[PDB]
Amino acid sequence: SGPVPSRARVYTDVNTHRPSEYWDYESHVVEWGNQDDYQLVRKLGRGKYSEVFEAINITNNEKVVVKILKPVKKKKIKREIKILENLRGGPNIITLADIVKDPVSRTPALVFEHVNNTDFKQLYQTLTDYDIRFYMYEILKALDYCHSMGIMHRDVKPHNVMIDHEHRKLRLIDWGLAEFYHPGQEYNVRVASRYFKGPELLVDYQMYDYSLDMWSLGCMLASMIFRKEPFFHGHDNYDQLVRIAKVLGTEDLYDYIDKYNIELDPRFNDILGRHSRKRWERFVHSENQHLVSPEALDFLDKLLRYDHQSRLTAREAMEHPYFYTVV
């Protein structure tokens, strides 16, 4: 009678028990300020529906970040704006300072606090085992916060984590794919970046929850501790599940799809194969061994599980012995 329903093991009805205004972003009233108070400095990057600039607020000589949005779907702009306002001031969540539009073109822009992002290319060698545990803890603070607030990020990846290592400051950014969690809601599976997509998205299991961000965090941790970027290198979305299966094995993949009554796409039939469950220690080499520990492996093992319900929650994760050395 179709796939088996599922709901989050934590913060299940946080939106159900709150007023409609908190989660109804379509009904959210946005009030734009004037862009003229901002001075664009330099291009920091470019997304598919966004253009990110470094800027200065002329009124106080403060460095800000300006994200110009292509109005592809106003509903998505309203969703990002609503979520950013709801999470404002949360631990390690990018702060939305203002919302403005350019008078002439009317293109919407989000103004954020500034993060002085440390040279990551040069950073990949100076980070230690302590650094990884410390920064992992900080991302979990952000996730436990947005999950307690009924939001799932749905795009956790290195690119969306800004680190100012001189000041040990971490910010989770790009809430453009974030969504409000409503138990029983079927979500679009075309979220997150390929390398970070949870098995639920790949097998087309639409009733996912906050545990999706927990899979993405595992992908990130495995790439950090094992210095293998990305950890699951799929070449398409169908191949992505095969890359996971080569590590987690096909046995538990059927245990998963059977548990939730999932219909595997017939495109997998020829490519999936049969794979044994691998051991995390196999990924330890001379290059990475200085960042790998038993605690790190036990933690990793508990995040990268097929079954979204078996994954640690951000709270459970914060308690794990992997984090005993950090405040």
Ligand X SMILES: NC(=O)CCNCc1ccc(-c2ccccc2)c(Cl)c1
Residue of 55, 93, 136, 296 that binds ligand X (CB under 6 A): 136
Binding mask 152-181 for ligand X (x = CB under 6 A): ------xx-xxx------------------
205 is in an annotated binding site: no
End-to-end CA distance of the chain: 48
Q: How far is the CB of 156 from ligand X (least distance, A)?
A: 9
49 is in an annotated binding site: yes
Asked whether position 220 contacts ligand X by CB under 6 A, the answer is yes
Residue with tokens 């009805």: 13
> How far apart (Å, rounded) are the C-alpha atoms in residues 78 and 180?
12
Q: With CB under 6 A as the contact rule, which of the stretches 105-113, 130-138, 240-248, 265-273 interacts with ligand X?
A: 130-138
Q: Which amino acid is at 222?
A: A
Nearest to 227 by CA among 119, 157, 128: 128
Asked whether position 47 contacts ligand X by CB under 6 A, the answer is no
Q: How far is the CB of 253 from ligand X (least distance, A)?
A: 27
What are the distances in angstroms from CA 1 to CA 69, 154, 263, 283? 42, 28, 11, 41
52 is in an annotated binding site: yes
> How far apart (Å, rounded) are the C-alpha atoms in residues 301 and 296?
9
255 vs 287, beta carbon nearer ligand X: 287
> How far apart (Å, rounded) are the C-alpha atoms in residues 93 and 148?
13
Nearest to 301 by CA among 324, 285, 325, 277: 277
300 neighbors 232 (Cβ within 8 angstroms) = no
Q: Are strands 96-101 and 33-34 parallel, antiparallel or unpaired?
A: parallel
Cα 298 from chain centre: 21
Q: How far is the CB of 132 from ligand X (least distance, A)?
A: 4
Asked whether position 117 contacts ligand X by CB under 6 A, the answer is yes
155 is catalytic: yes
| Of 144, 155, 174, 209, catalytic | 155
133 neighbors 322 (Cβ within 8 angstroms) = yes
305 is in an annotated binding site: no
44 is in an annotated binding site: yes
Q: With CB under 6 A as the contact rule, which of the stretches 16-24, 55-63, 117-125, 181-189 interacts with ligand X?
A: 117-125
Residue of 120, 238, 268, 323 that binds ligand X (CB under 6 A): 120
Asked whether position 137 contacts ligand X by CB under 6 A, the answer is no
Q: How far is the CB of 45 from ligand X (least distance, A)?
A: 7
Secondary structure of residue 158 in the 3-state scheme: helix
46 is in an annotated binding site: yes
286 is in an annotated binding site: no
Angle between helices 237-248 and 250-259 (to 10 degrees): 110
DSSP state letter for 93? B
Tell me how many residues contact ligand X (CB under 6 A): 14
Q: How far is the CB of 153 from ligand X (least distance, A)?
A: 12
**Binding annotation for ATP:** 44-52, 67
Q: Which residues are catalytic?
A: 155
The residues binding ligand X (CB under 6 A) are 117, 120, 123, 131-132, 135-136, 158-159, 161-163, 220, 224
